[PDB]
Structure formats: C-alpha cells, structure tokens
Amino acid sequence: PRKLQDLGLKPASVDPATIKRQRKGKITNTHMTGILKDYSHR
C-alpha cells in the first residue's frame, strides 16, 4: 500500500497488521455481617 500511491494506482485496502499499529481488612460491624451490599459503581 505505501508504494501503490507512489505508482499512482490508488489502493482499495487499509494497511495490514505488518505496518505499525497499536486488599481485605478487618470488619468492625461483626453483628451485621453479610447484610451490607458491595457498591463498586455509582
């Protein structure tokens, strides 16, 4: 592809892959263990 444009013939292909591309701690509320739900998101 990088020489097809040099030869004037427009390629119909994108550049292929050969071209460069990209704790647990203690709990104090021991009398209510298990009723609290995890909330890792808003």
Partner 1 sequence: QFLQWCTLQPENCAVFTSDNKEMFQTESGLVVSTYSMVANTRNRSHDSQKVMDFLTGREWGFIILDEVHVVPAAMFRRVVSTIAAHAKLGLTATLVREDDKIGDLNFLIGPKLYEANWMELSQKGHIANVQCAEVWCPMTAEFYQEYLRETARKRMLLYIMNPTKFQACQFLIQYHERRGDKIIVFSDNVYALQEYALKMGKPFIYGSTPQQERMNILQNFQYNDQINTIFLSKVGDTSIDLPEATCLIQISSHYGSRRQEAQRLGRILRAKRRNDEGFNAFFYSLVSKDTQEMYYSTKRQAFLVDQGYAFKVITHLHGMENIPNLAYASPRERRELLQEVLLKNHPLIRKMY
Partner 2 sequence: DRPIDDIVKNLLKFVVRGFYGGSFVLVLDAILFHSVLAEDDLKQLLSINKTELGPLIARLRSDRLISIHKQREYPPNSKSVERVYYYVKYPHAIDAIKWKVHQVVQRLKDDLDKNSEPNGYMCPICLTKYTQLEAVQLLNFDRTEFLCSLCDEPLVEDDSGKKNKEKQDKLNRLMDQIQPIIDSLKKIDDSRIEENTFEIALARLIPPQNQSHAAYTYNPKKGSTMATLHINITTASDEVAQRELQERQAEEKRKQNAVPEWHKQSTIGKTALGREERENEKTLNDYYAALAKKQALEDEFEDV
Distance (Å, whole) CA 19 – CA 2: 10
Among 2, 5, 6, 11, binds partner 2 (CB under 8 A): 11
User: Of 12 and 32, which CB lies nearer to partner 2 in the complex structure?
Assistant: 12
Per CB under 8 A, does 9 bind partner 2? yes
DSSP string covering 2-25: TTTTTTT----S---TTS------
Give the DSSP letter of residue 36.
Answer: S
Among 2, 6, 10, 38, binds partner 2 (CB under 8 A): 10
Per CB under 8 A, does 1 bind partner 2? yes
